[PDB]
């Protein structure tokens, strides 16, 4: 007959901007086995509204901001009266959701199969068949303290053109510009990119169109931010990833990937956003090609009682599976909210470390190998030195990330 398949469009009614929250009312509640097509929006759409907002009803509904109203006021987990704007930009990602999963209990694991991904086409009739994205070299980027050309303190927006049909499998830089102070419709001036979704006045910037000429950047569409609401606080900054998932910024989290997240609160409360058209391992400059995407997902609940003796045994972190690999996500702190105590959401940005992240990845790969692949500690330690590759996920989200990749094909299986 009929499988259950929800459609969640991106609008001011279906997203939260810059935070996860266990207390948010779900947009929908589905059952294990059900599907959802979920539209997501890049929070960088107002870097060029003509290309990424205007004419797009969903984007317009989220980004609307004039002197007389702002459709989505809170952006981040901070005070409503924050001087930069409600939420303080303490968290910047537009998160479609939450999605509740019937019967999901703390200690369960949720499987999310990413079965398809499509670029959100531009509504601009001049660019039919194209989608645009934005890469911002930002004040929170790992490069920022290292620039050598004057002015050494600068932020730079680079707009990329993508083929929304997927016929062309590479991105083309369209133009770049240095960020100049932008006064928002409520009168707050932003001399750096300190608050998300501010409409840029294109009469106040100077565009350079000849950029990255004839360089063909491979497309790797993925969702930067995807996960389940954590228990430790009612409002959680969307920027740092953790045990619950979130803003992992692993380019591999896209079509054909299956993610597994530990459930920390009843109903699970899944959200997805921060769509990217492509990204490198490190996300050096602070962002990817930030670009709107629609995904189709299947949700499968795994009960705690059924985890032992499977790859999900005692799973406490975000685990990625493809047809041929497992990819494990280490962070500077495995659960930064718990491990850094009450002040975690402030202190994490002062405590970032790749060395800690690799230690964490070591622990997780040891666990995976010991608890799911029948290896002793000594076996796991040897194998991971010779047959696991560890890479840098991102160094720009406060809780930094290292991933560990192992091929399925080497193992005899259970």
Q: Which residues sit in the known binding site for Mg(2+)?
A: 247, 249, 274, 276, 283, 290
Size of the site for its own copies (CB under 8 A): 68
Cα angle, residue 407 at apex, residues 404 and 409 outer, rounded to 5°: 160
Give the position of tokens 């990413």. 114
Query: Shortest Cβ distance from residue 251 to Mg ion (Å)?
Result: 10
Question: Does residue 141 bind Mg ion (CB under 5 A)?
Answer: no
Q: Which of 3, 67, 69, 149 binds its own copies (CB under 8 A)?
A: 149
Question: Does residue 285 bind its own copies (CB under 8 A)?
Answer: yes
Question: Does residue 249 bind Mg ion (CB under 5 A)?
Answer: yes
DSSP sequence for 197-228:
TPPP-TTSS--B--TTTT--EEP--EEEEEEE
Site residues (CB under 8 A) for its own copies, limited to 18-47: none
- Tell me the sheet residues that pair with 156: 137, 178
Burial (CB count <10 Å: 0-12, 13-18, 19+), residue 32: middle
Q: Which of 67, 203, 214, 350 binds its own copies (CB under 8 A)?
A: 214
Question: Does residue 266 bind its own copies (CB under 8 A)?
Answer: no
Site residues (CB under 8 A) for its own copies, limited to 375-414: 375-379, 381-392, 395, 402, 407, 409-412
Site residues (CB under 5 A) for Mg ion, limited to 266-285: 274
- Report d(CA 118, CA 97) in Å as an integer: 18
- Report d(CA 175, CA 286) in Å as an integer: 18
Question: Does residue 359 bind its own copies (CB under 8 A)?
Answer: yes
Q: Which residues lie closer than 8 Å to 395 by C-beta, 6 or more apart?
A: 142, 282, 283, 284, 352, 354, 401
User: Residue 338: which H helix or E strand, with range?
Assistant: helix 336-339
- Residue 224 contact partner, candidates Mg ion, its own copies, none, CB within 5 to 8 A by sort of partner: Mg ion
- Residue 247 contact partner, candidates its own copies, Mg ion, none, CB within 5 to 8 A by sort of partner: Mg ion
Taking residue 400's Cβ as centre, other Cβ atoms within 10 Å add up to 28
Q: Which of 40, 46, 61, 176 binds its own copies (CB under 8 A)?
A: 176
Closest CA to 99 of 40, 34, 29: 29
Question: Does residue 169 bind its own copies (CB under 8 A)?
Answer: no
User: Residue 159: which H helix or E strand, with range?
Assistant: strand 156-163
- Residue 249 contact partner, candidates Mg ion, its own copies, none, CB within 5 to 8 A by sort of partner: Mg ion
Query: Shortest Cβ distance from residue 360 to its own copies (Å)?
Result: 10
- Report d(CA 42, CA 133) in Å as an integer: 8
Residues of the binding site: 247, 249, 274, 276, 283, 290
- Report d(CA 394, CA 398) in Å as an integer: 9
Only one of the segments 45-53, 104-112, 142-150, 198-206 lies at the binding site for its own copies (rule: CB under 8 A); that segment is 142-150
Number of Cα atoms under 13 Å in the Cβ half of residue 299: 34
Question: Does residue 147 bind its own copies (CB under 8 A)?
Answer: yes
Residue ranges in contact with its own copies by CB under 8 A: 135, 137, 141-143, 146-149, 156, 158, 160, 170-171, 173, 176, 211-218, 278-289, 353-355, 358-359, 362-363, 366, 375-379, 381-392, 395, 402, 407, 409-412
Residue ranges in contact with Mg ion by CB under 5 A: 224, 247, 249, 274, 288, 290
């Amino acid at each position: 007959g009929h499988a259950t398949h929800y459609y969640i469009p991106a609008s001011d009614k279906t997203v939260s901007w810059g935070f996860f929250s266990k207390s948010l009312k779900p947009v929908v509640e589905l059952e294990s086995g059900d599907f959802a097509t979920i539209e997501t929006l890049t929070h960088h759409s107002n870097d060029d509204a003509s290309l990424m907002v205007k004419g797009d009803p969903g984007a317009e509904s989220v980004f609307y901001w004039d002197s007389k109203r702002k459709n989505v006021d809170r952006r981040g987990m901070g005070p409503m009266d924050h001087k930069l704007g409600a939420g303080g930009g303490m968290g910047v990602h537009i998160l479609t959701g939450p999605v509740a999963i019937k019967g999901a209990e703390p200690g369960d694991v949720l499987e999310v199969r990413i079965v398809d991904v499509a670029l959100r086409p531009s509504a601009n009739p001049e660019f039919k068949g194209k989608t645009f994205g934005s890469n911002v070299a930002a004040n929170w980027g790992f490069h920022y303290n290292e620039l050598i050309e004057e002015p050494k303190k600068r932020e730079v927006v680079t707009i990329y053109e993508l083929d929304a049909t997927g016929e062309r499998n590479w991105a083309r830089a369209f133009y770049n510009y240095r960020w100049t102070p932008q006064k928002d419709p409520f009168g707050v001036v932003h001399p750096i990119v300190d608050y998300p979704g501010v409409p840029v006045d294109h009469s106040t910037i100077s565009k350079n169109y000849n950029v990255l000429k004839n360089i063909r950047v491979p497309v790797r569409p993925h969702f930067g931010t995807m996960g389940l609401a954590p228990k430790e606080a009612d409002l959680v900054n969307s920027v740092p990833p953790s045990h619950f998932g979130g803003n992992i910024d692993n380019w591999r989290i896209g079509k054909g990937a299956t993610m597994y997240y530990p459930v920390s609160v009843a109903g699970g409360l899944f959200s997805v956003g921060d769509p990217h058209a492509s990204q490198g391992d490190s996300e050096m400059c602070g962002t990817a090609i930030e670009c709107s995407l629609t995904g189709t997902f299947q949700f499968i609940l795994h009960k705690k009682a059924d985890l032992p003796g499977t790859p999900l045994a005692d799973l406490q972190y975000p685990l990625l599976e493809t047809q041929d690999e497992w990819v494990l996500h280490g962070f500077s702190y495995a659960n930064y909210l718990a491990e850094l105590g009450p002040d975690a959401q402030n202190s994490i940005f002062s405590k970032s470390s790749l060395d800690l992240a690799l230690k964490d990845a070591f622990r997780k790969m040891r666990h995976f190998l010991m608890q799911t692949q029948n290896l002793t500690e000594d076996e796991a330690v040897s194998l991971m030195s010779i047959g696991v590759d560890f890479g840098i996920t991102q160094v720009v989200d406060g809780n930094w990330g290292v991933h560990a990749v192992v091929k399925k094909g080497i193992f005899p299986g259970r």
